Amino acid sequence: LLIHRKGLTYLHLDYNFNLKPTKTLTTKERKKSRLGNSFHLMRELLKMMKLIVDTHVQFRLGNVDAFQLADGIHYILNHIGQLTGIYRYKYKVMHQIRACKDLKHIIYYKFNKNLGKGPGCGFWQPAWRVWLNFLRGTIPLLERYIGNLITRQFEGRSNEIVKTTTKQRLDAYYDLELRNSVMDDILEMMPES
């Protein structure tokens, strides 16, 4: 609903939350259709959820197994780097992944002692704790962003928009204050007209 409401019907979402154009786009389309970190971040995030919820589904369908499940969500929570692409829209998340890899190694050695190199595993407590706390982090952040995205979507963007001085536009402002300051003086020296 947010995609179509923006007027873009040519971006298709699949059911794994990958967002692809269904068409070749004119330039004006590519400009209209660049979506921010709000949307995309939240897309990646749901994609993670959907992924896990699916693994449990295939367990209840009988299609899988007991242990293959636990190994499954372990594999997810460790490999989020590779399975998602959330790391694009907040690069900070790279901390968690590093954490979630380290645990992996620590976990494997105790687990893997005396037996095997294979995939068998499935102690997912620590990684789950990590992702979960990261998710504590961005609740307020996404509430803020998507709040602005949608309030801007109903109510239009602000008309005032004052814009601060920064590295780029500084010299221009310096010029401007100066020419004004000279106007004042040279107007107040003159006798009248």
Binding site: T151, F154, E155, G156, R157, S158, N159, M190, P191, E192
Partner: protein, 48 residues
């Protein structure tokens, strides 16, 4: 008829303030009275 005035609890999801929408407006300047502006060259231009 008197009256009793009562607020309605909004559906938290729906926009509160259904009609708040950024729009720009030109206001008139309504001048009721005039403020008298009350103050107290020849060769000068050749200087200035």
């Amino acid at each position: 008829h008197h009256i009793e005035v009562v607020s309605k609890q909004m559906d938290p999801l729906l926009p509160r303030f259904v009609g708040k929408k950024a729009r720009k407006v030109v206001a008139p300047t309504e001048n009721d009275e005039v403020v008298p502006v009350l103050h107290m060259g020849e060769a000068d231009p050749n200087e200035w």
